[PDB]
């Protein structure tokens, strides 16, 4: 599962000591069901190599937990490499418009199901199928 950094949807935080997450409580005493995502520190010019399992939670994370509780499967949560959604942008050889971002990681097999704030439009649905919003 791949996502992108948006705070009201996916809160991304480094871990407490090593791998474990802070047992945060809401305003009603509910412990936040977090997940151990795997994310980089920054982009490749900004961060040379700092990619660790971090804590991820929030809106779409709880949606993914509800889907993993409803259907009978386990999962894996990672992050997008760059900081883009993904557009049909040109590449050097053959003057071909290739993909990038979350779609570039999905179509390359590095992801299995994009659970993210994907703004549904024509061009993203021209190639892959979607679900109901």
């Amino acid at each position: 599962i791949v996502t992108i950094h948006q705070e009201p949807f996916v809160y991304v935080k480094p871990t407490m000591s090593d791998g474990t997450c802070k047992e945060e409580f809401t305003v009603n005493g509910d412990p936040v069901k977090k997940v151990i995502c795997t994310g980089p520190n920054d982009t490749s010019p900004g961060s040379p190599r700092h990619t660790v399992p971090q804590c991820c939670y929030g809106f779409c994370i709880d949606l993914l937990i509800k889907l993993a509780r409803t259907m009978n499967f386990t999962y894996e949560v990672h992050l997008v490499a760059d900081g883009k959604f993904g557009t049909q942008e040109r590449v050097n050889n053959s003057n071909k418009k290739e993909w990038n971002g979350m779609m570039g990681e999905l179509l390359s097999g590095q992801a299995d199901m994009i659970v993210a704030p994907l703004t549904i439009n024509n061009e993203r649905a021209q190639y892959i199928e979607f679900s109901k919003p």
Partner: protein
Amino acid sequence: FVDQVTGLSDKKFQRPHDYSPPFRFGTVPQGSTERNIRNNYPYMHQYMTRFNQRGVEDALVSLKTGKLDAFIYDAAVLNYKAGRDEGCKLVTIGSGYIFATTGYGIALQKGSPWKRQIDLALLQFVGDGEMEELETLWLTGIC
């Protein structure tokens, strides 16, 4: 500029004796909203069963003539009814926040080849502002 009802699951919605006047509301009979209520709250349907009515504009006249106080229906249809309301008297509650939050669509047979074409055509029609032009033409949200 006040809120008479909080939302779909108000604390007043458990007992009409909690209301000091006899409260009344309604839906349309045999609708999908009734099925959604029955799959959410069967007791709400049991209160509403004594408070049914005929149709859309019949309930509109019952709201204007003081025979009815609330009416549970679809979001955009009641938004249009507030748009054609006689001087913005009947006002909706919010803009679809404590509600079912679904959408319309085109129903097709299972396995039809017309699915992907209509999908791409509708997502193109949203993608060039033409759907917004049609919503401006047919839905006038006054006041």
